[PDB]
Amino acid sequence: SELLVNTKSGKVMGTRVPVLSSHISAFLGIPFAEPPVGNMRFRRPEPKKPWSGVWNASTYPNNCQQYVDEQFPGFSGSEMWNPNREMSEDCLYLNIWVPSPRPKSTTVMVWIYGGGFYSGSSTLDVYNGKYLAYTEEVVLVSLSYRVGAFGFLALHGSQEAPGNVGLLDQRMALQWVHDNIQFFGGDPKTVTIFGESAGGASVGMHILSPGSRDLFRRAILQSGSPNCPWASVSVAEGRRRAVELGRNLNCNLNSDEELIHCLREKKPQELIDVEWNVLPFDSIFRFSFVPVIDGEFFPTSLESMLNSGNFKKTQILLGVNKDEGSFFLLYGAPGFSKDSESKISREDFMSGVKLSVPHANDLGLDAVTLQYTDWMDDNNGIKNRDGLDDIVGDHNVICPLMHFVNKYTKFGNGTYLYFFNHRASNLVWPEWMGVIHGYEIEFVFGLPLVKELNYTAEEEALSRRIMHYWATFAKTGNPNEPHSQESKWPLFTTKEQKFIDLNTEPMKVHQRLRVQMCVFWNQFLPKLLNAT
Amino acid sequence: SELLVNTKSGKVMGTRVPVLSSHISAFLGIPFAEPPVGNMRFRRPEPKKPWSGVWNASTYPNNCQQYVDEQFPGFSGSEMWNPNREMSEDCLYLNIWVPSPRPKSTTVMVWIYGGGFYSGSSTLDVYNGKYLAYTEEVVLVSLSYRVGAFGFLALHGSQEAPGNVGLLDQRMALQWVHDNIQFFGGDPKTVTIFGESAGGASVGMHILSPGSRDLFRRAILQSGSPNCPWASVSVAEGRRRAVELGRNLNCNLNSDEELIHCLREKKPQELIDVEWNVLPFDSIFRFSFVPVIDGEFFPTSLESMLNSGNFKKTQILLGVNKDEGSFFLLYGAPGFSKDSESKISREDFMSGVKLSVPHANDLGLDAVTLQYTDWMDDNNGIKNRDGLDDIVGDHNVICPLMHFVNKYTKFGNGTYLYFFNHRASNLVWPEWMGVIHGYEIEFVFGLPLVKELNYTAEEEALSRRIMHYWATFAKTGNPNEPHSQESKWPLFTTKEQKFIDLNTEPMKVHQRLRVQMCVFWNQFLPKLLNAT
Numbered sequence A, B: 001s002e003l004l005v006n007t008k009s010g011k012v013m014g015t016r017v018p019v020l021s022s023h024i025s026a027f028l029g030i031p032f033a034e035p036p037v038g039n040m041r042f043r044r045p046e047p048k049k050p051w052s053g054v055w056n057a058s059t060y061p062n063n064c065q066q067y068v069d070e071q072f073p074g075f076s077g078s079e080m081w082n083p084n085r086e087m088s089e090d091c092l093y094l095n096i097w098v099p100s101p102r103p104k105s106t107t108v109m110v111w112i113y114g115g116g117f118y119s120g121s122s123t124l125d126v127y128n129g130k131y132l133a134y135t136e137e138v139v140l141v142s143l144s145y146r147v148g149a150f151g152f153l154a155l156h157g158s159q160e161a162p163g164n165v166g167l168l169d170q171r172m173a174l175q176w177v178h179d180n181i182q183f184f185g186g187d188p189k190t191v192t193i194f195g196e197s198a199g200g201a202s203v204g205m206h207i208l209s210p211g212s213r214d215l216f217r218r219a220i221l222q223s224g225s226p227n228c229p230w231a232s233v234s235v236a237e238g239r240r241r242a243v244e245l246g247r248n249l250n251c252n253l254n255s256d257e258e259l260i261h262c263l264r265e266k267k268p269q270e271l272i273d274v275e276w277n278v279l280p281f282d283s284i285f286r287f288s289f290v291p292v293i294d295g296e297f298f299p300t301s302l303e304s305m306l307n308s309g310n311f312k313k314t315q316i317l318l319g320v321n322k323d324e325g326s327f328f329l330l331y332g333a334p335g336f337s338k339d340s341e342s343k344i345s346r347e348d349f350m351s352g353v354k355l356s357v358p359h360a361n362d363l364g365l366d367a368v369t370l371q372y373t374d375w376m377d378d379n380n381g382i383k384n385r386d387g388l389d390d391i392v393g394d395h396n397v398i399c400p401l402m403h404f405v406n407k408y409t410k411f412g413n414g415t416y417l418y419f420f421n422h423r424a425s426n427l428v429w430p431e432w433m434g435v436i437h438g439y440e441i442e443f444v445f446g447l448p449l450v451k452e453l454n455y456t457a458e459e460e461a462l463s464r465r466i467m468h469y470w471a472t473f474a475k476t477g478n479p480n481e482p483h484s485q486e487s488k489w490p491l492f493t494t495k496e497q498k499f500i501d502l503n504t505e506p507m508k509v510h511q512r513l514r515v516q517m518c519v520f521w522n523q524f525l526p527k528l529l530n531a532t
C-alpha cells in the first residue's frame, strides 16, 4: 500500500490528501524521540523506542508548549502563527508529504520552523508541505523541537538541563530522516534543511556544529543566521536567566539540582507565564531561552568558527525581506499601532533605538541615531518610522546575515543570495509594515497557488518561481535550471557579491546588499562599543 | 587739497588713483603703531607717536615678515598670495581708499587679511580697495598685523611675549580708524570689519573680545570663524611651541626671559625657517603660531563665551565656499598634484583623513572614514578625492562656522548666511579643486569689473551684486535694498536657518547648510573623542 511504510522504528500509515486537484500522501505526527516529559524536561532527547503495530500518521501531532500571542484576538495576521493544535510537552514529531506515486530516490527538504526559539509549530497552515511536495516532486519533511525554557533552559555543567536541547531535537529528527527517509522514497544523500528566522539561524547552527554537519547535504536560510544578536547567549547569561526563572517561581536556588527539580514540578504554563521576566534589558527582538555557546554543540565562539572555516562546506541559498523589523516595533515600541500609520516623533524614535540596541551605551545610541536620521527633515514622522524599521531589521537580521554570508562564501562551495521585497496583495497587516518578517514563507510553500486564498496571478507566478528555485537548489546546489532560457540568479562571490530581488517584476541583479548600513553594524558600532 | 588730510597723528598726503575710467584718493602706508622692532618683538604694539610734517601716503607699506610660498615658482595661482612688497618687521600700516569728491560721513569697511595667521598682506592685488570704494562709495580701509611667531609667539605669564599681539595690532588699527576716519569722510559709527579665513576668524575674535567690541559696528566673516580648530591654542600648547621654537634655534631654555631674549637676537628669516617644526602632529590645516585662549583677550573658552552670549550683539553676514579644503590637500596630502586630476586610492584616502583630523584616535578616524565613504563604490578615485576635499572643508571651515552662526544667532540682531559656489572661469588652478578657499575674495573686491582680467559678463554681474550686498549690509545691517525688486536674501533664524547660494544663477534659498555633516563634526565626533 502506498500509504504504508516500514521504517526502522516500526510501520507507519499515512493518508491520501488532495492538493491542487490531485493527490499525494501525507505521514503526519511521526514520533522521532521519546516524549521529553517528567524527569526528562530540559534533558537531551532520547531516540524513539521502536513500536510494534502500525503507527497512525493521518493527523497532525500536538504542538510544543509555548507562549501564545493574544495581542490581536481573532486577527488572522497574528493567529496564523499560533499553535493550531493542543499544546503538550509530548511534541517531538515530524511530518512527511510524499509525491504519488511514491518516488524511489528524490530530493528531500526538511523545514525547520521559526518563532524566536520561544514559539513555533510544524502544523501551521503556511507550512503545509503538500503544494511544494506535489509541485516540485520533492519529499517534504517538517520537524519540530522544544522551544522556550523547555528547549533552551541552560545550566552549563549540569547534565540535567545542559542547554541547546531544542537544537538536539532538531538534530535527532535530521538523524531519523537520514536513517529512514529512503523508505518514503527520499534520497538521504540529498536532503536540504531550510528554515526561517530562528529556523534560519538553527539551519546555520547545524552548519557550524560538528555534530550536525553530516546529517544533511545543503542549506537554505530565510531571514536568520547563526550569528544573529538574539540567537544565542553565553553560558553565564543562560545560567543567570535560568536562575532568574527559578526566582520567579519561588524555587530553591541553592544548587542546579534544587533549581532543576523545582522547575520540573511546575506545570508548563507556569514557566511560560514568567518567561519574559528574565530578559536583562528593556528590549525588542530579544528572547529569553535561546541556544548557548557551550563549547559542545558549538566548539568555540561563532565568530572564530566563521573566521577559521570551522563549519560544513557546501552550497547555501539565503536571503532577507525588505522590512524585517516592523513586526517587533509593532509589538514593543511606543508609537506603533496596528490600526494607524504609526508616524513616529523624535521622542518615540529615541525610545525606539534604545529598545532596539539594548546593549549600547549612550555614545553607541548616538552613533545609531546619527546613522539613521535625516537631519534635514528630522521631524518627519514617516522617516522616523521607516528609519526605526530599518534599524531593527539591519541590526537583527540583515547585517548579521550579510556578515555570515561574507564569512561563509570564503570557504563554501556556492552561495545564492536574495532580497525579497514583494508585499502580498492580500496582507491583513497595515501598509506601514511593508514586506513583513515571515511573509516570504507563504510564497516558499506555495499558498498563492490556492485560488481561495486570493493572491494575484503574478503572485502565483512568483511563488511558482521561488518554489522552483528552492527545490532546484535542493536537488542540484544551484537554483537555476541547467540550459533554461530564464534569467540567471548569479552566484554570490567574495568579489562581486551579487544578489537578486525576489518579486513579481523582471529579475534584477544587484550588489553589496546594504553595505553602508552593515559596515556600521558589523564593523564600526562593535568597535565603538568595545572601545567605550 | 582733496589728497591732504589732517589726522590726530599728523598730516597725511594721498595720491589720486584711476579706477574704472574715473578716480578716487588713496592714502597708502599710514602708520598706526610704533614699529614692533628690536626689544619690542613679540610685545604688544604701541600707538604711533604723532609726527610733524606731511606723511607721504602715496605708496604701499612693507609687508610683515612671513613664510613665502615657493611651491609653484612663477605660478600666479600661488604667488598672488605672497608678499608683493619688501618684507620687514616694521610693517604696521593701514591703507584707505576714499571716494572723490571726499564724502562727509559715509559707511566704512575695514578689511582684515587671511593667511592662517602665519602669512598675509594688505597690499595684494585681490585686496585693492579702489573698486569697492569707488563702486559702492564707502571708505575702504585695509589694516595689517604681525603674523607667525612675530604676531603670536605665546608665553603666558610673561609680559614680553604674552601672545595675541597680532590681534592687538588689528585692534590698534581699528582704534586709529575709530579715532581718525572722520577726517577722511568716514563715519566712525558705521564701520564694518570683514575678513577671510584667519581674517574671518579674527573678525569673530573681535566680536568675542570685550576689548575690541566697541571699535566697530557690524561684521562680515568669509570662510572663517573664531572657533575654528586651527584658529587658536591653549596657553599650554602655545608655551610648548614657543619653547620648541627656541630649541630649534639652540636657545637657552632656562627661563622665559632667556628664551625671549634669545629669540629677539635672531634675524626674522631664522624664525621663519624653523616655524613649521613646532606643530605637534603630522597635519594639514594647522599653523604654528595662532591666537591663544589667554583669559585676557578671550575672558574664557570660546565655547562658553558663545554659550553665554558673552560677545558683541549686532548684525553679521558670513559664509563659506564650496570646496574650502582642496588647497590644503594639494599642498600636504599624498596623491594630490596641481597638474593631475588627483584621483585618490583608499590608501591615500586613509592617509588623508589621518592628516585632516590629527587629534583623533583610531575610533575617531574610523567614524570619519565611514561618514565620508560610499561603501558601494569605495575604490572610486574621484569620490575619494572629493570626499577628502569635503572632510577638510567641513572640519576646518564649514562646520565650525555653522556652529558659530547657530550660537551667535541666538543672541545677535541679524544674521545673513551665504554659500559661495561659483568657480571663476579664468581660474588657473586645476578643475578638481573646485570653488577654492579664498576665491570669493576677488568677487568681493570687484576684480571682475576689470576688463583685462578676463572674467565673463555674468561674473562681473555677480561681483557687482556681492559688492552691493556687502556694502549695503555695512551701511544698514541688511544686504538687501529696502524697496528693491530683486530677490531677497532672507535672514538666517534659529528656526528656519535659511541661506542663499552666491553664483551667476538666479538666487536660490536653502536651509540647514550641511547639517548632516556638521552634526557629525559638531556633536558626534567630539563626544566620541571625549568618551574614548
Ligand SMILES: *[C@@H]1O[C@H](CO)[C@@H](O)[C@H](O)[C@H]1NC(C)=O
Residues within 6 Å of the ligand: A056, A057, A058, A059
Ligand atoms: C487515525 O487516528 C485518528 C485520531 O483521531 C483518527 O481520526 C483516524 O480515523 C485514525 N485512522 C485509523 C485508520 O486508525
Ligand SMILES: *[C@@H]1O[C@H](CO)[C@@H](O)[C@H](O)[C@H]1NC(C)=O
Residues within 6 Å of the ligand: A412, A413, A414, A415
Ligand atoms: C565546488 O567544488 C567543486 C569540487 O570540489 C569545484 O569543482 C567547484 O569549482 C566548486 N564550486 C564553487 C562555487 O566553489
Ligand SMILES: *[C@@H]1O[C@H](CO)[C@@H](O)[C@H](O)[C@H]1NC(C)=O
Residues within 6 Å of the ligand: B056, B057, B058, B059
Ligand atoms: C612719496 O614717496 C615715494 C617713495 O618712493 C615717492 O615715490 C613719491 O614720489 C613721494 N611723493 C612725494 C610728494 O614726496
Ligand SMILES: *[C@@H]1O[C@H](CO)[C@@H](O)[C@H](O)[C@H]1NC(C)=O
Residues within 6 Å of the ligand: B412, B413, B414, B415
Ligand atoms: C534688532 O534690534 C532691534 C532693536 O533692539 C529690534 O527692533 C529688532 O527686532 C532686532 N532684529 C533682529 C533680527 O533681532
